[PDB]
Every structure is written in structure tokens, then in C-alpha cells.
Amino acid sequence: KYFAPANTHNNNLEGQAIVYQNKFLTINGKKYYFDNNSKAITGWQVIDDKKYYFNSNTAVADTNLCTINNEKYYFSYDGILQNGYITIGRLNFYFDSNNDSKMTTGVFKGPNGFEYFAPANTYNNNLEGQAIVYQNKFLTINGKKYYFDNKSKAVTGWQTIDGKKYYFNPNTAIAAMGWQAIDGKKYYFNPNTAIATTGWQTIDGKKYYFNPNTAIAATGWQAIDGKK
Secondary structure, three states, X not given: OOEEOOXXXXXXXXXXXXXXXXXXXXXXXXXXXXXXXXXXXXXXXXXXXXXXXXXXXXXXXXXXXXXXXXXXXEEOOOOOEOOEEEEEOOEEEEEOOOXXXXXXXXXXXXXXXXXXXXXXXXXXXXXXXXXXXXXXXXXXXXXXXXXXXXXXXXXXXXXXXXXXXXXXXXXXXXXXOEEEEEOXXXXXXXXXOOOEOOEEEEEOOEEEEEOOOOOOEOOOOOOXXXXX
């Protein structure tokens, strides 16, 4: 309850309880929001299309990197829940906007491209969510494959790895699988290995020929090994 200062509401005395419905109140930089019953609300709340988390013991607008149910969140200086790419100290963290802004791990686009925010105790990193240096390696997360360069950044398009050609989506860096149309040309990528198919191939009981050099699906009249 808000034992308001003198003359705040209906000439209330110092420390008198007043009617305070559906409005914010800032006291010594601490924020509260009151519902229609002149009660300070608590818990997860949404006001003016903005998400707040009022502590269950203080009803104060928690405004910083703070753990909830063993999951970190980042509330901005004035309480509002914010999501995206966020730097803390010298460590970068990502908060999926679609996942209640909950701290996640994966590969996500920061200012210089896609980065690997790894779980705890990964290849060289023990802090969960932190960007780790993944230089010139492949990574598979829940089946999705990516490759990273010397800048620990993902890529997209055509790539030759260990003598095998792969195609990664420029917009998502996901390895191509199955039938794909790239720049008007049809290519078939192995569903399991994502390797572009070359030469004669039998798919779904139908024979196909892929150019050994370009892997482009054969169309129209074609002369192969002296046969049309």
C-alpha cells in the first residue's frame, strides 16, 4: 500500500493511504505500478504493451540482468524487458525476441555477422550464452549445420569442404538438403550429408543425371559417354 506524502491525494496527511489506481509511481528511482484496487501489483506484468517483472517481496520494478526460474533475463534501466544482442561486461549474450526474451544459445547475427553463443563448458568457453571463438570449423546444433571462418562468423552460398561441395542459405546459413533451385538451376543435395549430388542418380525410383563439374540437374537433350 502507498502511504503517500502530505497533500498528494485529497489532502492526505503524511503517510496516509490514498487511492492510486492504474498508474505508475517512482519513489527514489524505484518503480511500482498500481492496479484498480490501489494495490501494488507483483509478478510478471504487461503494461502499455511493455513487459515488467515486479519482485514478489518488494513489488519493485526489477531493472537489470536478473535470474528467474534458473533462466536469465535483461530488463533495461527503467524495467522494460528488452531482447536481442546485448553486451554485458566483455561478454556478448543473445535473447530471442520470440522466446519470452529468455537467454538462449545458438548461432545468431550480431553486428559483425553470425556468432556462436555457446552453452556452458563448450569447446573453449565455460560461460553459457557467451560468444566463443569458432575458427574454421563446422558446428551442428539440433541437426542444423553451419560453418565458421577465422573471424568466428558464419557464411552462406556455395562452399567446398574436404573436396565436397555444399550450399548454405545466405539468409540463414543452413546447409541445403534435397531438391533445391538456386539462381534458376536445379540441384539435389543428399538429405543426410547435404553433399551436392553428381553424375547419375536414382531418386524416388526416377533416374537423374547431374553435371560432374557443376552438379546442375541435366535437362533437355544431353550427350553422355557417347550416348544421347
